[PDB]
Homo-oligomer: A and B are copies of this chain.
């Protein structure tokens, strides 16, 4: 049943908080989920497919929250609008730091994980660019850089900066400061002449 599959995923996420995926065996996942190794292979072909599934759930959680925001504009200024949107990624991925860090490392080694991340980044960049274009059309932002190129760089900044903060990398922006830092750069670069 789905319960055994969910047990595997819950075990994987918890074990990923203490060691990398290269330090997790299929027997570890089976044992923590209360199943045998052959039973595990009925639900997943590999431990990498387990991570892929975990990462897919996290990215779709962030995507669905962003869609929710897009359909219900909040009644605030332009700065808070961008902050509320960037915060979706801050909170969703910040609530799944182990899966986030694991998925970032797997991008090099897994074509499926690299394609998953690329597909969602393309979608989020396209939406960012559409909002910038709307702001220009209504006269609220100046026509400076091509909107899509600007949106690409800003989203890549968020990816790199958020993930450095969550991993505690050196250098990084402190996690308590990263939202204000990113919002400042987005707002000045989108609305500055």
Contact = CB atoms under 8 A, between A and B. Distances in A.
A181 interface: yes
Interface in A17-44: none
Nearest to A155: B171
15 contacts: A118-B170, A118-B171, A121-B171, A144-B184, A145-B181, A145-B184, A149-B181, A152-B171, A153-B173, A153-B182, A153-B185, A156-B164, A156-B171, A157-B161, A188-B189
Interface of A: 105, 108, 118, 121-122, 125, 144-146, 149-150, 152-157, 159-161, 164, 169-174, 177-178, 180-182, 184-185, 188-189, 191-192
Contacts of A172: 152, 156
Which of A177, A181, A185 has the largest number of chain B CB atoms within 10 A?
Answer: A185
Given A152-B181, A188-B189, 10 more contacts: A144-B184, A145-B181, A150-B181, A152-B172, A152-B173, A153-B157, A153-B161, A156-B161, A156-B172, A185-B189
B171 A149 contact: no
A171 B122 contact: yes
A144 B185 CA distance: 11
Given A125-B171, A157-B161, A171-B122, A185 B150 contact: yes
Contact of A149 (B153, B157, B173): B173
B185 A185 contact: yes
Contacts of A184: 144-145, 150, 189
A42 to B, nearest CB: 31
Contacts of A188: 188-189, 192
The 4 lowest CB-CB distance pairs between A and B, nearest first, are A188-B192, A157-B157, A160-B160, A192-B192
